[PDB]
Amino acid sequence: KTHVQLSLPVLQVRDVLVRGFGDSVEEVLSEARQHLKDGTCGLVEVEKGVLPQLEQPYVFIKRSDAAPHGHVMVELVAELEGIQYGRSGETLGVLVPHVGEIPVAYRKVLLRK
C-alpha cells in the first residue's frame, strides 16, 4: 500500500529518552520509516522550546492533503541546520523513537509510504 493508517503515541518532550533517529538526513528519514512500520515511533507536538530539546537532523510529519477515517494524510520532511529535505503542508509534529514512554494522546495519521 502507498499509504498506511497509524495511531502515533504523542510524547511530552521532557519524557523522550531517544531524542532523534540518527546523524544524517538520509539516516533519520530511513530510521523514521522503519520505526513507523515497526510501531516504535512517537510524535512530539512542536511548540516554543521543543526543537532545541531534540537532536538534529529532525524528522517532521507534515499534512500532505485536506482525512480518511479520522486519519490526517501526512508525509516525512527532514531538517538539518535550517534546510528541509522535502516540501509539504503544516507540521503535525516531530518524530522520535518510542521506547515505552507514556503518551498524553494518540495522533491518527495516513502515512505516504
Swiss-Prot record:
Annotated localization: Host cytoplasm
Boundaries of every CoV Nsp1 globular domain copy: 2-113
Effect of K37R: In strain: Omicron/XBB.1.5, Omicron/EG.5.1
Region spans: Disordered: 1-113
Function: Inhibits host translation by associating with the open head conformation of the 40S subunit. The C-terminus binds to and obstructs ribosomal mRNA entry tunnel. Thereby inhibits antiviral response triggered by innate immunity or interferons. The nsp1-40S ribosome complex further induces an endonucleolytic cleavage near the 5'UTR of host mRNAs, targeting them for degradation. This inhibits the integrated stress response (ISR) in the infected cell by preventing EIF2S1/eIF2-alpha phosphorylation upstream of stress granule formation and depletes host G3BP1.
Protein name per the record: Host translation inhibitor nsp1
